[PDB]
Each structure stands twice: as C-alpha cells, then as structure tokens.
Amino acid sequence: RQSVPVASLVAEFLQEHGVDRVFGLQGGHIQPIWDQLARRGVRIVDVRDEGSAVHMAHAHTELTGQTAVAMVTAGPGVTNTVTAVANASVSRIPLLVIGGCPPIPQSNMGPLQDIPHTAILEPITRLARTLRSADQVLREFDEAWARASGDRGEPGPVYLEIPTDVLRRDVPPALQMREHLRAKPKRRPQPHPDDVAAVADLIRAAEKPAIISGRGARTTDGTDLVRLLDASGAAYLDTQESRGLVPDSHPAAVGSARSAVMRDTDLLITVGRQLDYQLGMGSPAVFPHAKVVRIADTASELIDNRRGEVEILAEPGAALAAIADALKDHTPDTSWRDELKAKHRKRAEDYRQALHSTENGADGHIHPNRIFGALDALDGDVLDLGETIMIADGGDLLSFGRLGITKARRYLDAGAFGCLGVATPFAIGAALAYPDRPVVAVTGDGAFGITATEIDTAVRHDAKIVVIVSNNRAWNIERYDQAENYGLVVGTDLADSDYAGVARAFGAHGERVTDPAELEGAIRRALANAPALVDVVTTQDAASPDSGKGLGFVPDYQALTPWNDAEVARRQ
Amino acid sequence: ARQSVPVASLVAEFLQEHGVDRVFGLQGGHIQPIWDQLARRGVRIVDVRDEGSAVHMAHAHTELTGQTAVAMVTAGPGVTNTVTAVANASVSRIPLLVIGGCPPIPQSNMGPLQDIPHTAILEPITRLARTLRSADQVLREFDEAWARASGDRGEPGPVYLEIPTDVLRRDVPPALQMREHLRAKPKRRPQPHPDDVAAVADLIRAAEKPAIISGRGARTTDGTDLVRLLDASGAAYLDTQESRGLVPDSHPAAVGSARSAVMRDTDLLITVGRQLDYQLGMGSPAVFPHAKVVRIADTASELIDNRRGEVEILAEPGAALAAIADALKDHTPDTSWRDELKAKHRKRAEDYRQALHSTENGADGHIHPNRIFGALDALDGDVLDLGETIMIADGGDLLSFGRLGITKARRYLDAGAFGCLGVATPFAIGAALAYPDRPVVAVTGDGAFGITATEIDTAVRHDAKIVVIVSNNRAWNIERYDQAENYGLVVGTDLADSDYAGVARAFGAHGERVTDPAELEGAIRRALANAPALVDVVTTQDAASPDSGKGLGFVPDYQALTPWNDAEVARRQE
Amino acid sequence: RQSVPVASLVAEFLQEHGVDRVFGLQGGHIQPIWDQLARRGVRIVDVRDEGSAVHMAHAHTELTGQTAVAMVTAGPGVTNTVTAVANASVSRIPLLVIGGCPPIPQSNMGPLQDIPHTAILEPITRLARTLRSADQVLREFDEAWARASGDRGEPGPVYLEIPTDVLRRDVPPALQMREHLRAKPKRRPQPHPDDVAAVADLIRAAEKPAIISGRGARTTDGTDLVRLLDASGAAYLDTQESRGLVPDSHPAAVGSARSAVMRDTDLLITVGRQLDYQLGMGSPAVFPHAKVVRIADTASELIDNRRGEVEILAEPGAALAAIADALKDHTPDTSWRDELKAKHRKRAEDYRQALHSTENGADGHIHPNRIFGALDALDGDVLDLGETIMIADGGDLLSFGRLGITKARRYLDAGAFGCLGVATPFAIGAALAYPDRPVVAVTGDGAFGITATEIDTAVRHDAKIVVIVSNNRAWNIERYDQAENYGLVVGTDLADSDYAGVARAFGAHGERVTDPAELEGAIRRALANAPALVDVVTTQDAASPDSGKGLGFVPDYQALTPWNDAEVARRQ
Ligand SMILES: CC(C)(O)C(=O)SCCNC(=O)CCNC(=O)[C@H](O)C(C)(C)COP(=O)(O)OP(=O)(O)OC[C@H]1O[C@@H](n2cnc3c(N)ncnc32)[C@H](O)[C@@H]1OP(=O)(O)O
Ligand SMILES: CC(C)(O)C(=O)SCCNC(=O)CCNC(=O)[C@H](O)C(C)(C)COP(=O)(O)OP(=O)(O)OC[C@H]1O[C@@H](n2cnc3c(N)ncnc32)[C@H](O)[C@@H]1OP(=O)(O)O
Ligand SMILES: CC(C)(O)C(=O)SCCNC(=O)CCNC(=O)[C@H](O)C(C)(C)COP(=O)(O)OP(=O)(O)OC[C@H]1O[C@@H](n2cnc3c(N)ncnc32)[C@H](O)[C@@H]1OP(=O)(O)O
Ligand SMILES: Cc1ncc(Cc2csc(CCOP(=O)(O)OP(=O)(O)O)c2C)c(N)n1
Ligand SMILES: Cc1ncc(Cc2csc(CCOP(=O)(O)OP(=O)(O)O)c2C)c(N)n1
Ligand SMILES: Cc1ncc(Cc2csc(CCOP(=O)(O)OP(=O)(O)O)c2C)c(N)n1
Ligand SMILES: [Mg+2]
Ligand SMILES: [Mg+2]
Ligand SMILES: [Mg+2]
Ligand SMILES: [Mg+2]
C-alpha cells in the first residue's frame, strides 16, 4: 500500500465492493472522486437530473441484487435526489448516494451550497453522514454499505458526503485495511426448527392457505417458494415488487382472483412482504377469515399492522424450503385453490385475448389496453417477453399495465410510493444491466414529462430502451376523480404534445401512432431501432381498475373505497 | 355572516384574503379538496410538469412582486419533488408557502400511500414545517406560518403546511373562524434608533472611500432612499445578483465593472440587506483589507454573518437609508475616489458592451455566447425595451457571461447563491404571468435547461410569453474546463448537439436553431414576436467565463475563488 | 496578539462579553476551557448536577439582563441539562451551554460519550453546533451569542461543543478579530409612528382598557409602562415572569381582580407577553369583550393565538413611551379601573391579613399560607421584602405562593414549563448575583427532592439562601386530583423526611417547624445564618386555587376547568 488521497481510496472501495458503474451528474465537489473512478475503469453513467441517477441505481440493485451507487454534487445536486431516495427507502432497496459538500474551514459561513444535506436525508435513509476524518473514510464506507443491506436497520438507501478538503487529504498505508476494502457476502440468518414445525402445523390445519410474496421473496429465484406451494396446496398471489417467481401455468398462480383469495383464505402467509395499503393494511376487514404467518429476513416485513401466529426472521429461501420439508407426508386439500384456478384460466385468458381488439373511446382515440395487446402479439416474433424487463408508470396507464403485463422476466413500476417518472431512468438502469435485449417501459404522458430529458441519457450511453407513452393529453386518473367526485375538471389537462419529436430531438428513434392497427409495426420498428419512443394518442374515455375503486379520493382508512367500506363496517 | 364549512374551503378563503390570486402546483388526490375550492373562488391554478418548478414559480413571483406566493403539491413524491426549490428559496430568504398533501390521521405509520416524514425532511430548510391535525386551528396555523415566512420568529423564507385528508374534509363552526386570521396583514416596519443613525453618519464623514454593497433587503425597496444616501455620502456602489436595478447605470456611484477595485480599497463597507457569504469573499479582511464594516438590514441574517458591524442597524432598510441621508444634510463628501473609479468604469463597461456585438467564433467554429448579449443589446429600443424587461440567467459559463452581458434589465433573476441549475424556465414563467405586458427573456446553458425543459409545455398551456435562449455548447462546459485544466481528463461532462428548438416545437412553442452569429438578432426578433419561444444557439466550447478562470469549479479550502483563496492563505500565515 | 489555543480564546471571548462567572460541573472534555477560565479570574461555580448549573445561568440572565453561561462535559454532562435548557427555551431566556465532545478522529467509532448532543438539543435551542474549525471558533461564539439574544430567532438558549482536539489547536493571531471578542449592545428596534397613533386611537375609543405584561416588559424598569397606565387609565395585570414593574398602590394595580379584568376588558394590550395557557390562549372564551393589541421586541409575543388589530415590533420601553406621548390631551375614563381597585384593596388586604392566622388542617399540620404570613410579619424587622428576591416552586405550594408573595423586588418560579426543582438552583444564582441580602425560596417537598443536593453548592460557594419547604409528605396537588377525579390515591405520597437534617448534613443551618407560632423565629434564625433551610410540617388538607380549578386534570382545550367550560360553550 502507498499513501493516497481519500478520493482514490473511495474509488478503490467501490470497485472492490463490485461497483462497475456509477450513475451521477458531475460537480466540482465530487470531481476528485469522479476523476479516480474513471482512472480505475469504472463506467460513469452521467445523467440530465441527479434524481434519475438514483432511480437508475435503484433499478440496478432491485434487478441484480448488487448494491448500486449514485454520485451528485453539493446543494442542488443532493436535493435533486430526495424523491428517488424516498422511493428507494419505501421500497427497501440498498443503495449508496455519495454527495459533495463544502470544505470544513467554511462550515456555517455561507460557502457555495452549504445546506444541511444529512438533516434533510436522515428521515429517509438508513445512514446520512458527513465524513470529517480522512483516516476513517474507508471504514465509514464499509459500515454504511452494511447498513444499506439492513444491518442495524432494514434494507434501503444510505448517504455519505466528504468535505472537499478531506477528499484531497492523504491516508497513510497502515490505516488502509483490507477488511474495509473487500466485498462482503449477504447475511443468511436461518430459521429455528420449532417455528418451521409450528408453521407446518398451521398449514395442515388450514383448508384455504394463501401465500402473498413481496420484495424479500423476489431476492430468491422462486424455486423454494414453488416447493412450498406444491407441499401446502396454497393459492399464490404476487405484488408489483415480486412478479416472475412462479410460472403462470402453476396450479397455485391465480393472479385474476386477488379479491377472492383475500376474502376467503383461512391462512395468509406473507413472504418478504409488508401488509401496507397495497394489501389492505392486512386488516381483518380485507382478510376476514385469515390467521396470519409472516416470513422475512427483516422485521420490516414481520411486525407491520398484523403480527404472525408464527413469525420467522430468516433468509426466505431457507425458511420456505424448511417448511416444505416439514410437510413431508402431508396430502394438501387443493379443492379451493383448483376451483380458483379454473375461474382464473377463463378470466385471465378472456382479458388477455380482449387486449387485441379493445375499441377506441368515445373521443375516437386508442384504448391504452391495445398497447398491451400489441406487445402480446409480438411475443415470439420480434421479442421474447419472458426474457424482457417490463416497466410501468403513470395513473390509469399504470393500473391498466398491472393487468396488461403478464409475461415479463422482471417487472418494475412506480412502487408503493407511487413515484411518477421512474419509467425512463428505470429502463436505462435495466438496459445497461442486461444489454442483450431491449427493455420496454410503458408510461403515462404526465409521468413521462418528469424525466423525459433522460431520453438524451439513453442515446448518449446507448441504453436499448423502448418507451411507449399513453398520450391521453391528461393526468387522466386525476381528471376522472375531479369529474366523478367534485363535478369540476381544472388543472389536470395536458396538451397533445409530440413526445416522438422530443425523442427525435435527443437523437432517439421516434414514431407517433393514432390508429390502433399501427401499434404492432410501430413497436416492431422501435425494438429494431432502440433507443426508441412510440407516442400513442390514447383516449380519455377509459377508467382503469384503480380509477373505479376511488384511489384518487383518499378514503379515511384504506387506499380504495371497497376496502374502506369493509373497514367502516368492521369498526361498528 | 360565517357558516360551518370544511377546512379545505377555509384554506382557499384564507389564501384569497391574504392576496393570493394564483397557486402554482400539480394536482394529486390528497390536495384535490383545496384545489377544487381555489378554482371555485376564482384563484388561477398554474399547473406544472414537475412540482419543483411550481415552487420556483412562486419564488420568482415573491422576489419580483413582494407578494408571498404559494405552491400546492400532493403527498410523497409531490412534496419530495419540491426540496431543491425549497432549499433555493431558503438560501435566498424568499417568503413562500408550500401546501403539501398527506395521509389521513387514522392510517399514520401504517404504510398508507405516501406516508413519508415530509415535515422532518423539510424542517432544516424551512422557517416552519407542520402537520395540521386540529380542524378548528387550521386558519390560525396558516396565519402564523404566513407571518413566519415573512421572518417573524426567524428570517424570511419558505414555510411548509400539510393537512391530513380527513382533516381537510372536517367542518369548522363559524365562531372559530376569526376575521383576524383570515385578513391580510401589512409587512413589519421596525425603525432605526437615532443614536445608530448618528454613529453611521459619523463613520461616513470620517471615511475617504466609503462603499455600499446592496442585497435582497435593499431590493425590497424602490432604490430611491438608497440613492439619497449615495448622494449624501459620496460612496461607491456595487449590487449583487439579488439586488440589480436599484441605481441608474449613469449614477456617479455605479461602478459595476470595478468590483475588485472597490473591495480592495474601501475603508468603510456598508452592507444593505446583504449577507457577507462566499459571493463577497465571506467579508474576509483578506478580500476587504482596508474596510471598517457597517451592516443595515431588517433581519439579523444580514447583520451577524462572518463580519460584525462597528454599527448594525436592524430596521426597514428604506427608513434606515433615509435617516442616515438626513443626518448627512450639511456634509460635503470627498467623491474623488468614487469619481476616479466611475471615469474608468464608464470606459471599461462601454468597451465591453460594444465588443459583445462582434465577439469572434471559438476555435471549433461555433458562436461565442457573448454574441447572445450583443444581439439583445442591439435590439434594445427596436423590438424590445430592456429597461422594462425581466432578464433571467442560468448555467455555468453561460451564467458568468450573463453577469457581464446583462446590464439594462428592469429586474434580474438567476441560479442564486445556491447555484440552482434549472430555475431559468420556471422563473421566466412566474415572471411572465406576474408581468404579462412584455416578454421575459431567460438565457440558459444546455446543462441547466435539461433539468426543467418540459416546463416549456407549461408556458404554452398557460400562455406565458417567455423567450428562452439556450447556449447549446454540447457540454456542462465550466465543468469540462475544470477537468482539463486541473485533472487532465474530461469524462462524463459532454452532452450532445440536441435539438432544443425541436423540443420546444414538440410542446407547441415557437423554436428556431441559430448556427451563424449574424442570424441572432433576427432569431431573437422572431422569438419575441412569437412567444412563448426558444432560440437554440450552437455555441463554442472554446470560451472561458470569468468564473471558469477563477477556479469556481475547483472548490478551494477557504473561499469559492482561487484569487480570494490565495489572499486568505496569505492572511493566515501572517 | 499571540498564537493561542482555542480553549484560551474561548475563555477570553467569555470574559470580554462580560462573563464574570461560569456555572458547571467539571469533566475532562471541558477541562481545557475550565483551566483557562480559572487562570483569567472567571469565578467557577461548580454544582452537584449539570441541570442546576443551567438553572443558575437562567436565574442570572432573567434577573440581571446579562447572558449567562453553563459548561458541562460530554455525554451525561450534556444530557443532564435538557430539562433546564427546555425551561429556558420556553421562558425565552438568553443563555449559552458549552458542552464537551469527543475528538474528531474518533467520530461515530463509540468513543467515550459520543452521543448526538446537537440533535437532542436542536428542537429546544436557538442554535446547537459542533465547532470543527479552530480558526472560526471565535466567530461561531459571537454569532451564537447574538442568536441567544433573539437574532435570526427569538431569545433563548444556545449550545456549542468543541471536540477536545480542536480545543487544543492553536489559532494564529491574524484570525483573532476584535469584533468577535468584544461585547455587543442589545438591539433597540423603534416603533413606527403610524402604529403608535393607531394604538392611541384604540385606547381613546376603549372604556375598559387592560394591560397584561410579560417577559419583554420585565426587561424594562417599568417607568414607561407606568407612564402609559397613567395616560390610558388602563387596568394592570402582571404574570409570574413580569412581577415588580408597577407599585402595589398604583390605581391600575388590581392583582386580585384577574378574572374580572379578563372577563370585561374591551381592549387587551399585551406587553412582551405570550397568550399561552397562562392567559387562556387569549381565547374569546376568556376575553369575551376584548379587541387585541400586541407590543413586543420579538414576534414570539406578537403572533401566537391572537393577532393584534395593531402589532408593534420594537423595544417595549420606547413603544410604551411613544403611545403615552400620543395620548397627550386624552382624559381617560378610569371609572371601571377605579371600581376594580376599590374591590382589589379589600380582597387583597383581607387575604394578606388572613395569612397570619390561617388554621391548621384537619390532620393537625400547618397551613402553607402561614409561611407567607410569617414572611409578611418579618418585613421591616429582619428583612426588607421590597429588596428581596423571592422564588416559588411546587404544586399547591406554588399556587399558594402566587397569592402569598406580594412584596418582592423580583420573583422567579417554575415558569410556564412547570419545571419542578428550580427553587434551590434559582436561589443560588440569584444570591451570587445580589450578594448583599438573603434570597428566599419557598418550595414543595416533591419539587425540593429533585435539586436538594444543591444545598451543598450553596454552602461551598457561600450563597446566602433561605429555603423554606412545605413538607406535606406528598405531591399534594396530584394526591387531590387522584382523590377528586379518580377515587384512588396511589404513588403520590412521600414520607415525613427531615429536610432540616439534609441541609445540616451539607453544612447549612437547619430547623424543623411543626407549630405555626414558631415560623417567625425559625425564619429569623434562617435569615441570620444563611445558607439555611426551614422544614415546615404542612397539612395535606388545603386546596390551592390551581387544585380547585382542575390544573391536574388537563382538559381538552384550556389548562383550567372554568376556562375549558367557557371554550366548550364558545365552540357550540
Ligand atoms: C392518490 C393519488 C391519485 O394522488 C396518487 O398518488 S396514486 C399513485 C399512483 N398509483 C399507484 O401507485 C397505484 C396505487 N394502488 C395500487 O397499487 C393498487 O390499487 C392496489 C395494490 C392498492 C390494489 O391492487 P389490486 O390488489 O386490486 O391489484 P391489481 O393487480 O390492480 O388487480 C386489479 C383487479 O384485476 C384483476 N386482475 C389481475 N390480473 C388480471 C388478469 N391477468 N386478467 C384479469 N383480471 C386480472 C385482479 O384480480 C383484481 O380484480 P379483483 O380480484 O379485485 O376482482
Ligand atoms: C462548484 C460547482 C462548479 O460545481 C457549482 O455548483 S457552481 C454553481 C453555478 N454557478 C454559480 O452559481 C456562480 C457562483 N459564483 C458567483 O456568483 C461569482 O463567482 C462571485 C459572486 C463569487 C464572484 O462574482 P464577482 O464579484 O467576480 O462578479 P461578476 O459580476 O462575475 O464580475 C466579474 C468581473 O467582471 C467585471 N465586470 C462586471 N460587470 C462588467 C461590465 N459591464 N463590463 C466589464 N467588466 C465587468 C467585474 O468588475 C469583475 O472584474 P474584477 O473587478 O474582478 O476585475
Ligand atoms: C398538569 C400537572 C399537574 O402535571 C403539572 O405539571 S402543573 C405544573 C405545576 N404548576 C404550574 O406550573 C402552574 C400552572 N398554572 C398556572 O400558572 C395558573 O393556573 C394560571 C397562570 C394558568 C392561572 O393563574 P391565575 O390567572 O388564576 O393567577 P393566580 O395568580 O393564580 O390568581 C388566582 C386567583 O387569586 C386571585 N388573587 C391574586 N392575587 C391575590 C391577592 N393578593 N389577594 C387575593 N386574591 C388574589 C386572582 O385574582 C385569581 O382569582 P380570580 O380573579 O380568578 O377570582
Ligand atoms: C410526483 C407525483 N406528483 C403527483 C402524483 C399524483 C398522481 C398520481 S396518478 C397521477 C396522474 C398520472 O397521469 P399519467 O398521464 O402519467 O397517467 P394517466 O392516468 O394514464 O393519464 C397523478 C398526478 C404522484 N403520485 N407523483
Ligand atoms: C443541479 C446541479 N447539478 C450540478 C451543479 C454543478 C454545476 C455548476 S455549473 C455546471 C455546468 C452547467 O452547464 P451549462 O450547460 O448549463 O452551462 P455552460 O457551462 O455554459 O455549459 C454544473 C454541472 C449545479 N450547480 N446544480
Ligand atoms: C419534573 C416534573 N415532574 C412532574 C411534574 C408534575 C407535577 C406538577 S405539581 C406536582 C406536585 C408537586 O408536589 P410538591 O410537594 O412540590 O407541591 P405540593 O402540591 O404543595 O405538595 C407534580 C408531581 C412536573 N411538573 N415536573
Ligand atoms: Mg395521461
Ligand atoms: Mg426533481
Ligand atoms: Mg453547456
Ligand atoms: Mg408536597
């Protein structure tokens, strides 16, 4: 080892920890790190807005399991990340944000961009620190890295900033410890056999077991989950954060029976999933017959809103496998699951076939479902949807996408946070992670306006993305709440913008579609010429399931009117 | 004769009664009940493409008009999209109100849609950040927050209020709806003490080289009491980016091209509503080696930072300036230093401005950005009146060129002490809607513009007559230059030759590209006749601004700029 | 100037700013400052509990107007101050707390006492900062000093901590600026004449004007207040934080007519006073006929709960004088004030005479009012109450003290915060500030147990205090709420402790009293042998006004039941 500046050690720490790319936007306060990353051969993915760099890192970690890294300058560079940090905090995604900050001698003196970055980010990070001791920077990086994984907290984003005088300070070789530089494996806490047995007993006693998966299950490959589904006879639901773990044809997979499963299950088993608003707070009002069991590698998916009759805090794969083993010699009663599955095959197949011929709305414009129809039609022709990373974003468009996107290798969207504008930055992170196939992002026009200029980033970095915009000239799920519940539509209209022209202005391939019969060709040409955008002139006359269920109205107790009605009855 | 009405109605009424005739924002369900009531009262709703831009619009509105402005945004990402623009308003000490959505009280901490700790995130960069849980007290909490935005119990700047949707829908009995909370209130007017006035006038009589440097608080005045004091004192005058336009260009004190000379030699620095932050070298003795210090302001945020006054006046600055002018009634100032600076300033500024019309292309064959400022100067008195124009600047090298190139504006806005890239378009929109009779002109770097470009759509939908001129140098170019000069490696600072005119046309604005500098005057003339409009100017990468040359990109240990930093290193080793 | 360590410059800053004493408790982290203060001849008043040192500083500043200083070590030394800091924050008293903290190299590494002091104190200070730049320490001290006065905030406590490696670092003489070392005068913002005139017009139109004073009025000597009372014909009330500004015999002084003044005034004028719970939130329910005017040098006494038809933000003395001037040629209608005053003379004189002969309670023990009787009886004999600093603390005892303490030069008590245990630390600060006369502190036994060991501090530092304890073997106002509103008395009894013996064990003079006829002699002997304690065996059968009005019960809208009943009527 030689005496080297902090900036060099930070670059080395990152590379040794497996970082081969940093998302970011250059400023002088971080230039010393930026320089060293480039001299080490770390790819720098420079963006148009720092928020998008954090979104890119989120997508990288969520897909790959490798903690990703954004780097931004002092002041507005850091404050531009707060939305993307909050989003990663809510979704419990490990990532590191490296911020610039002013030199120590000028503290509190009004130097350029001295705002309290750590104070702003502390409520939505696992750690937010200013590193004032050159000798201890390496250690602070390694500990923050562990905390992003969930050590001393739960998985999520961490923030570190180094005053520029500290960045430029030398660290003697004695203080450069191999144990802080080196990559570390994930923790693997194991289940206790008594908890495994107690869950197996609940499954044997249950007539209508159901498993709902989430983030922690999606860290596994799905094979132990399928083993437990096979041993238990349970129905299976996933969530936006856990798509793709169970084959569609599996006798447990009943994705179009969500209400039926929640209403009747006598044993809900959560697997790395929160019982947040997305699952009716786990309320007895939404699960009126369910006993509860909770399995996760973090108590963030064990203690919220409902407690387990058993709770297992362990690596989910090992827990699922141990319970499957313990159900040796059990013959599950699958008659409820099978009855749901028969109804699911009809409902899901009818729905998917209908996507190819959905009528135009009263305004003469394309129903957004035709986008999902056209993608389904191209599957096995010009793209393999089962190898494709699908992204969804927007309001009505996002809700239609939850039903319209059924074959994807992986799925990302606006998350529990409802973070509009993720579609383009997610698509870019996904595409650079998996360069062999186009990534397809389907987005509302409202959402797309937030991060549209990242089309520039996609072209400059050659990220093979296809963005498809539902251009309905509106924040349409909002326009509909205003009409239905208030009788006045105001400040929710947008214009008939040329998003293909926006894409072409930033060097991407672009095409506008007004005729639904043109969608397959337009998407074919977009796939062949990625990065590409398809601007689809869509109807305002089309209520998504979210629209119809009051999501826009914000009831007192639950996100949706039907669940809220059930909760009001439970209360009395 | 009051009746029982929901909180959402009272909030809309509170705002209209406090003089709010417009609200910038982006609709979500959590704020819809307020949004609805604002529209039924006839308050204009200016709906944007990104909530950060709504807060920048409110900032511009307040900074120009002095009327506290309002942004309204939904829970979760709607609130977190504001943080940059809130920080910017906090650093610049601009009163504004952000009204955020938030989940109903029953669902607190349960993982409802968008339950993040908005108030904890915003508390470090607001004067007040609160969740309002008592229907009966919402009016009161609004009135108090409004007063704290003005600087009561703190200093001027942004405040944040959020009302859980169940509270928004709750009725308030009429007896709890107090006129005193609904009604508009006047600004405070603390007055100077005559002993402090006398003491300042004594310092001015004893000084040979008095200099006044203005800031935010001065810019809240019309400039006429400032001119009275300049006249009575014989002081030299500098402004800052936040105080342009208070003193006529031809005034014998106005020596804007003599910044280093004034700071090096003044024996009496008088700050008027101005911080001695990095923009004035921390007020360091290293940068003001001969100055005694006097500070005048209506807030100690412009009295106590880095240097203390031999006298500090905490008062409405207009009254303080007038009182000191009166106290100098029989003083005959020695103006010979000011006069010698002014004579040299006249020539240096005139030569500089003339040379803007003919600046040569850089080695890459592209337009020098100074030609944009030349073209605007040439059109003055032809198709636009720069003295009635609101000018905005944003970017890196472009912004530094703009500080020399923009000399005749009625009002000036830019990226601020925060160095907040992307303000150009949202500022221009707020400015144009405040002052609808003439185009607003925003000159921006391509880097900065990419942050808020989609707000061109907002300008077209709301008919904001803006002209945006882009220095398209295919780069974050002040950064590219720091990389080359101090590190020998240029990486992740290049952008592309994007069609910003095409982006503007895609959103229904007028757009044209300029590659030939002789085409600039026409392109800007056509842009002014067809606003909202963008002019995409292919500019050179071979052009170092004064900020570029002075190390701004490098971030020295003690001062923002190398020359000032060198002076501070010398001061330390005495 | 020479190159000197930060610790020396801090000692010099304090002495130059007028600090001639520092209250505190030594630890290694602050020893370098402690050492330099002692070498400069600054008196070190070392205490038994760091909280008491902050209370002492509070009393010094509140009495003298000079900002006072406590100094405490890292970790538990700082955390022991939080109550006394909160108390000073609520009362808006300028003070500086200097905390120790660990050296910079060991940050976040679990060094001895690395807890987040600044994060803990930030919600209840005007400034809380860690000073990491030796060169800028002087400047940070001067700015924090200004912020304690109210600059950029409102008057109250500030916290500064210097890592011990920074304390030991030299500062070059060039960076030691006279302007940061030197003492600074208080600000004096002046009224605008239009606001003065508008207030004078409201006074001319009012039939029943009333002035209520507070903290900001008590920063003046009272003479401009009396000028305005004379020019306006207003009734006058003070509050616990504004006693002693208006002579008792003044025709406006109607201290026993509090409810009558609030009920009928048609013009309430606050003078440096909050309309907090102590004045019924300024509610129309408590002031049903009042227009409102607010005068103060801080908007902390202008904007809370009621807005002024006029609000003057100025030095209160100048504002009061300007309004008195503007009432040149006004003949005030004093008939309401005079009618209140005639009733006041009878009520107050009857009450004060009755203090000399209050009966023992049913349990055979002294009524606490006899303490106030005995003090009244000694006035003009062995002490001059009009030159005496009186302190009150406790529950029932505190409430009886508000009526029983009527002649004092100055009065301190538990404050709006209701901070039990202030009595002894306040008495010590007061006594060292004004060494020529004994200070008398009257306290409940509950309150006294919190800070009793500071009797040791009083003896070691020769603070001439007399503490008189109402020893009723109870948190008695709490015992009474439990009996009246819950029917069960539990965990509110104390024991028949020997507080005279406690005092004698720490080297003070002590005496126990069981016979009310012994009180005058015991208090005479205590005054002659200060520091001294008188342990008065008092009754549990004695409801104070606070007890009778529900203070213990915490109603929904107001601190007291009658005010709360009025608010409930106003709401409907
Ligand atoms: C408040 C506001 C407007 O300002 C916002 O900020 S909103 C933020 C933007 N939007 C969001 O982030 C979305 C938030 N909401 C949601 O995530 C969802 O409403 C929910 C998770 C809370 C509830 O979703 P569901 O459990 O209903 O899941 P979906 O996948 O949406 O399924 C809807 C229905 O289609 C069914 N379905 C699913 N896949 C299908 C398929 N393939 N074929 C046919 N039907 C299918 C499904 O069973 C179900 O019908 P049913 O069983 O209730 O009768
Ligand atoms: C760190 C990083 C890069 O990552 C960032 O985030 S930077 C953020 C974006 N940039 C900014 O926000 C800029 C921040 N810096 C500044 O604001 C300024 O550098 C400063 C306030 C610190 C210094 O500005 P000056 O006091 O030098 O003022 P300017 O108006 O720029 O004047 C520069 C020179 O032009 C002169 N000048 C002004 N008007 C003139 C005129 N009309 N004609 C000729 N010369 C003129 C002026 O006198 C002076 O020359 P001199 O006296 O020093 O020799
Ligand atoms: C909640 C709990 C129990 O856990 C706690 O923590 S309590 C904390 C400990 N206690 C406190 O900090 C006290 C808090 N409360 C108070 O400060 C008071 O209740 C109050 C400020 C809110 C209200 O006080 P008042 O305005 O009633 O003032 P007092 O000086 O107490 O006067 C009481 C009465 O005696 C009268 N009075 C005053 N001086 C007199 C005199 N000299 N002679 C005769 N009567 C006199 C006075 O007029 C009034 O009677 P009326 O007009 O209402 O009929
Ligand atoms: C940053 C932010 N601001 C506001 C909102 C609130 C919202 C949730 S859904 C929606 C409408 C989205 O319109 P889009 O055109 O994308 O989709 P569509 O319904 O098909 O027309 C809004 C405004 C959220 N969640 N995030
Ligand atoms: C949100 C944010 N992120 C980064 C930065 C740091 C910066 C300051 S100046 C600059 C270059 C701006 O490039 P532009 O193209 O607008 O101008 P020009 O130099 O003429 O090419 C950067 C990146 C700031 N202040 N704010
Ligand atoms: C630190 C703290 N803990 C509890 C309380 C709550 C309280 C307010 S009054 C009171 C009883 C005081 O008993 P004392 O014996 O002093 O007075 P007396 O009624 O005459 O017997 C308590 C416990 C407060 N305010 N502060
Ligand atoms: Mg839309
Ligand atoms: Mg943003
Ligand atoms: Mg550029
Ligand atoms: Mg007691």
Author numbering:
A (entry chain B), C (entry chain B): 16 to 587
B (entry chain A): 15 to 588
Can you list sentences taken from the study reporting this PDB entry?
Actinobacterial 2-hydroxyacyl-CoA lyase reversibly catalyzes the thiamine diphosphate-dependent cleavage of 2-hydroxyisobutyryl-CoA to formyl-CoA and acetone. pmc2-Hydroxyacyl-CoA lyase (HACL) enzymes belong to the thiamine diphosphate (ThDP)-dependent decarboxylase superfamily and catalyze the reversible cleavage of 2-hydroxyacyl-CoA thioesters to the corresponding carbonyl compound and formyl-CoA. AcHACL is the first published HACL crystal structure and forms a compact tetrameric assembly such as the OXC and ALS proteins. Interestingly, a unique feature of the actinobacterial 2-hydroxyacyl-CoA lyase is a large C-terminal lid domain that, together with active site residues L127 and I492, restricts substrate size to ≤C5 2-hydroxyacyl residues.
To gain insights into substrate 2-HIB-CoA binding, we have solved an AcHACL crystal structure in the presence of the inactive cofactor dzThDP to 1.55 Å resolution. Berthold et al. have already shown for OfOXC that the acyl-CoA substrate (2-HIB-CoA in AcHACL) can be trapped in the enzyme by replacing ThDP with dzThDP, an efficient inhibitor of ThDP-dependent enzymes. In AcHACL, the substrate 2-HIB-CoA mainly interacts through its CoA moiety resulting in multiple interactions with, e.g., residues Q255, R273, S274, R362, R417, K564, and D561 of one protein chain. The 2-HIB acyl residue, on the other hand, is well positioned in the active site by hydrogen bonds of its carbonyl (Cα) oxygen with atom N4′ of the cofactor and with the δ amino group of residue Q128 from the adjacent protein chain within the same dimer. This brings the Cα atom and the thiazolium C2 atom in catalytic proximity of about 3.3 Å. Furthermore, a central water molecule (W1) forms hydrogen bonds with the tertiary alcohol oxygen atom of 2-HIB as well as with active site amino acids H44, T88, and Q128. In the obtained AcHACL structure, all substrate-binding pockets of the tetramer are occupied with 2-HIB-CoA, indicating that the asymmetry between paired active sites observed in the pyruvate dehydrogenase E1 component or other ThDP-dependent enzymes is not found in AcHACL.
